[PDB]
Amino acid sequence: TVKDNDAIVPIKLSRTAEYIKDYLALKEIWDALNGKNWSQQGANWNFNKELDMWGAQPGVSLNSNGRVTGLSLEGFGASGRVPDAIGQLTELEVLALGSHGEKVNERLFGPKGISANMSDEQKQKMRMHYQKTFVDYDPREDFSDLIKDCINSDPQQKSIKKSSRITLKDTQIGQLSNNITFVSKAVMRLTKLRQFYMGNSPFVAENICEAWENENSEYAQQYKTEDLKWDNLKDLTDVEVYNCPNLTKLPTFLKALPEMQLINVACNRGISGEQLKDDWQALADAPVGEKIQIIYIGYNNLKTFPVETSLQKMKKLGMLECLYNQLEGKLPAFGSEIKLASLNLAYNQITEIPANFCGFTEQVENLSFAHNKLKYIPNIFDAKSVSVMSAIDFSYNEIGSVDGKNFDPLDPTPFKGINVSSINLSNNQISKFPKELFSTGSPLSSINLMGNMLTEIPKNSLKDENENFKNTYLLTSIDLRFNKLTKLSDDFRATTLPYLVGIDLSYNSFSKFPTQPLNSSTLKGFGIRNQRDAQGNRTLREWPEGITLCPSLTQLQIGSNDIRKVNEKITPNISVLDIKDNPNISIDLSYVCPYIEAGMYMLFYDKTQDIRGCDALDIK
Ligand code: NA
C-alpha cells in the first residue's frame, strides 16, 4: 500500500501470519452469525483474550501451527449469513453448519466424532451414525415375547436387543436448529475439506454456496481473481444437507463435486417428489454418480427413483435408505452389478421389486421392505449363497393377496430362495404356507408368519412326501399368531424339525390340540392362548396330556381358552405357566407349589379356578 503527502509514500505491509488471519476470519464468522447470542445445547466462543488465543474455541480444532482444521456450529443456534471470510480457513478438513445430530442432542463433529485427521475406523463409525440412529432395526423384534424369551435363553442364538431406532415426530420435520440464511461461495477455496454438513436451516437452495456473501468484501475481491472451482475439492467425500424446510430443490454444488461418497439429503420435504427424483438423476448422470457409496434420502416425497440407465451408472453404490417417502408401483432397477450392504425401503407404497433390482455384498446383516404394498416375495436372492444374512423384513405388505400366491407366478426363473437366518412375513395376506422358502434350502432358523390368512399347514409344507429339505433342521422359531389355524401336520414332529425351540400358535382356531410340535426334545416354549372360531367361541377345551414329558419345555401359555380336566400333575420344569382365564379348568399344582412359595415359579391364574394342591394361592 502507498499513501500521499504530491508525493507517493509506501506504507510498510503488516506481514500478518496465516494462523492469525484465520482467527480474524473466525471472529468475522462469529460476528456475521450473531455469535454474541449463541447458546449451546449439550458454551460460546470468547474473544476477550489475546489474538493468538482466538483459535481456542468450543467446536474448533487447530493444528501444531495454530491453523483451523475443523469448525462446527452444531448446537450454537447461529443466525445470519456465512461470510466470504470462511475462504481464509484453507486448512479446514471438517465443517458443520448444522447436522442430524442436533435433532437427537448429539455433537457429530468433535474429537470423539467427525474430526480433522481422524482414523479410517472413526470415519466409518461416524458415517454409520445416521444409520444406527434412524434406520437400523432388528426384524426379529416382531416375534412374540414367548419366542423372543426362548431366543434370548438360547446360547446358540444372538439375543434380541430392545429397540433403539428413533422415529422423527412431524414436529421435528422442518424444526430449525439455527437461522443460517446464506452460505458463501468461498467454501470452493477450502480445497482440503473432507466433510461438509448442514442441517435444520431456513436457507433456500440458490443461497447455498452460489454467490459471494458480500462481493465488496476484502475476501470476495481477492478470491474473485483466484478462479475457484468445485472440481478442486478432491477430498470432500461426506456431504449432508439435512432437514432444510425451505429447500425446493437440492443445492446445485453437489453434482459439481468430483469425489463425494456419502450424501445425506434426508427430511427435505419442501422438495417435490419429481424435483428430488430429477436432482438424484442429475447426481447419477454427473461424474460424481460413479463415486457415491452411501445415500440417506429418507423422510422425503419421492414417488419413484431415477431411470434404470441413470441408476446403473452408480457402480460404487453400497447403502440406500428411502424410509418414509411416497414410493409407488414397480421400482426402477440398479442391476445385479451394484452390490448393496444396506437396503431399507420401509414405509412406502411399493407394489413390486424388479428381478434385477440390485446385488448384495457378503457383509449384509439386515434388509427391510416393510410397510409397502408388495404382492410377492421378490426373487432377487439365492439360498445357495455362502454369505447368510441375519434377517429380512417383509412385514406389513400384501403378500399372498393376489390369488394366494406368495411368489410372482409370471416369474420366468423359479424362486432361488433366500440366504437369510430370519424372515419376517408378519401382517400380510398369506393363505398358503410359503413352502418354496424351505424347498430351495433357505438357511432359516426363524420365521414370523403372524397376522396372516393361514387356516392349516398341511402334510407336505416343510418337506416332500419321502424326503426332508437340506436346511429345515435349522428352523428353531415359528411365529404363527393371529391366523385362523385349525390344523398342523406331522411336519412339526422331530422327524423334520429336530431342533425346534419356540412355537407360538396364540390367537388361532384350534379345537383339537396340535400335539405334533411337542415331539421335539429341544422345545422350550409353546403358546396356544385365546383360541377362537369365526363366531367368537372358545374352541380349545383339550389339555395336551403328556406335555409334562417335554424334556426341555419351561414355558407353556394356554390362557384365555376353555381348558377342562388336566390329569397329569404339573412338573416344576414348566416354570412359566399361564392358565389364566380358563374358568372350567381342573389342575393339580401339588409339585409346583413349594416352587411358587419360594418365588421360583411364574404362574398366571384366577383364584376362582379349580386349582388343587396349593393353599398359598388363596383359591376361593
Ligand atoms: Na443449533
DSSP string, 306-366: PPHHHHTT-TT--EEE--S---EEEPPP-EEEEEESEEE--SSEEEE--TTSEEE-TT--E
Taking the centre of ligand 1 as the mean of its atom positions, its distance from the CA of residue 81, in whole angstroms, is 15
CA distance 166 to 133: 6
CA distance 224 to 604: 79
Phi/psi region, residue 274 (left: phi>0; alpha: psi -120 to 50; beta: rest), is: alpha
Query: What does residue 360 show for φ and ψ, rounded to 5 degrees?
Result: -145, 145
Taking the centre of ligand 1 as the mean of its atom positions, its distance from the CA of residue 128, in whole angstroms, is 22
Q: Give the contacts of 346 (CB within 8 A, at least 6 positions apart).
A: 323, 368, 369, 370, 371, 372, 393
Q: What is the CA radius of gyration of the chain?
A: 31
79-82 vs 68-72, strand pairing mode: unpaired
Residue 423 bridge partners (DSSP): 392, 447
**8 A C-beta contact, residue 478 and residue 503:** yes
Q: Which long-range CB contacts under 8 A does 226-230 form with residues at least 24 apart?
A: 226/189, 228/87, 228/185, 228/186, 228/188, 228/189, 229/188, 230/188, 230/256, 230/257, 230/258
End-to-end CA distance of the chain: 104
DSSP 532: B
Phi/psi region, residue 105 (left: phi>0; alpha: psi -120 to 50; beta: rest), is: left
Taking the centre of ligand 1 as the mean of its atom positions, its distance from the CA of residue 76, in whole angstroms, is 5
Q: What's the per-residue H, E or C state across 92-147?
A: CCEEECCCHHHHHCCCCECCCCECCCCCHHHHHHHHCHHHHHHHCCCHHHHCCHHH
Query: In 3-state terms, what secondary structure has residue 250?
Result: coil
Taking the centre of ligand 1 as the mean of its atom positions, its distance from the CA of residue 43, in whole angstroms, is 12
Taking the centre of ligand 1 as the mean of its atom positions, its distance from the CA of residue 239, in whole angstroms, is 18
Domains and CATH numbers, the chain: 1-620 (3.80.10.10)
CA distance 403 to 22: 69
Taking the centre of ligand 1 as the mean of its atom positions, its distance from the CA of residue 200, in whole angstroms, is 8
Query: What CA–CA distances, in Å, run from 492 to 145, 468, 523?
Result: 21, 12, 11
In single-letter form, the type of residue at position 158 comes to: K
Q: Give the contacts of 592 (CB within 8 A, at least 6 positions apart).
A: 570, 571, 572, 574, 577, 601, 603, 614
CA distance 480 to 474: 17
Taking the centre of ligand 1 as the mean of its atom positions, its distance from the CA of residue 29, in whole angstroms, is 15
**8 A C-beta contact, residue 79 and residue 179:** yes
b/e per residue, 358-373, with b = 16+ CB within 10 A?
bebeeebebbbbbbbb
Taking the centre of ligand 1 as the mean of its atom positions, its distance from the CA of residue 180, in whole angstroms, is 10
Taking the centre of ligand 1 as the mean of its atom positions, its distance from the CA of residue 97, in whole angstroms, is 8
Query: What CA–CA distances, in Å, run from 513 to 11, 276, 476?
Result: 102, 55, 20
Environment class of 35 (CB within 10 Å of its CB; exposed 0-12, middle 13-18, buried 19+): buried
**Number of helical H runs and strand E runs in the chain:** 9, 31
Taking the centre of ligand 1 as the mean of its atom positions, its distance from the CA of residue 193, in whole angstroms, is 21
Taking the centre of ligand 1 as the mean of its atom positions, its distance from the CA of residue 266, in whole angstroms, is 17
**8 A C-beta contact, residue 378 and residue 351:** no
Residue recorded with cell 421400482 = 331
Locate breaks in the chain with C to N over 2.5 A; list the residue preceding each: 5, 42
CA distance 38 to 41: 10
- Going by C-alpha positions, the residue among 517, 524, 420, 522 that lies closest to residue 471 is 420
Resolution in angstroms comes to 2.7
Q: State the Cα torsion 542-514-459-451 to the nearest 10°.
A: 120
Taking the centre of ligand 1 as the mean of its atom positions, its distance from the CA of residue 83, in whole angstroms, is 18
Here the cell at position 211 is 454467490
Taking the centre of ligand 1 as the mean of its atom positions, its distance from the CA of residue 264, in whole angstroms, is 18
User: How many beta carbons lie within 10 A of that of residue 73, not counting itself?
Assistant: 27
CA distance 119 to 518: 53
Which experimental method was this entry solved with? X-ray
CA distance 544 to 562: 13
Here the cell at position 562 is 376353555
DSSP 285: H
CA distance 72 to 107: 9
Taking the centre of ligand 1 as the mean of its atom positions, its distance from the CA of residue 445, in whole angstroms, is 46
Here the cell at position 618 is 388363596
Taking the centre of ligand 1 as the mean of its atom positions, its distance from the CA of residue 179, in whole angstroms, is 9
Environment class of 86 (CB within 10 Å of its CB; exposed 0-12, middle 13-18, buried 19+): buried
**8 A C-beta contact, residue 540 and residue 563:** yes
Taking the centre of ligand 1 as the mean of its atom positions, its distance from the CA of residue 84, in whole angstroms, is 21
Taking the centre of ligand 1 as the mean of its atom positions, its distance from the CA of residue 199, in whole angstroms, is 9
Residue recorded with cell 467427525 = 114
**Secondary element (H or E) of residue 223:** helix 218-223
**8 A C-beta contact, residue 86 and residue 29:** yes
Taking the centre of ligand 1 as the mean of its atom positions, its distance from the CA of residue 79, in whole angstroms, is 9
**8 A C-beta contact, residue 266 and residue 291:** no
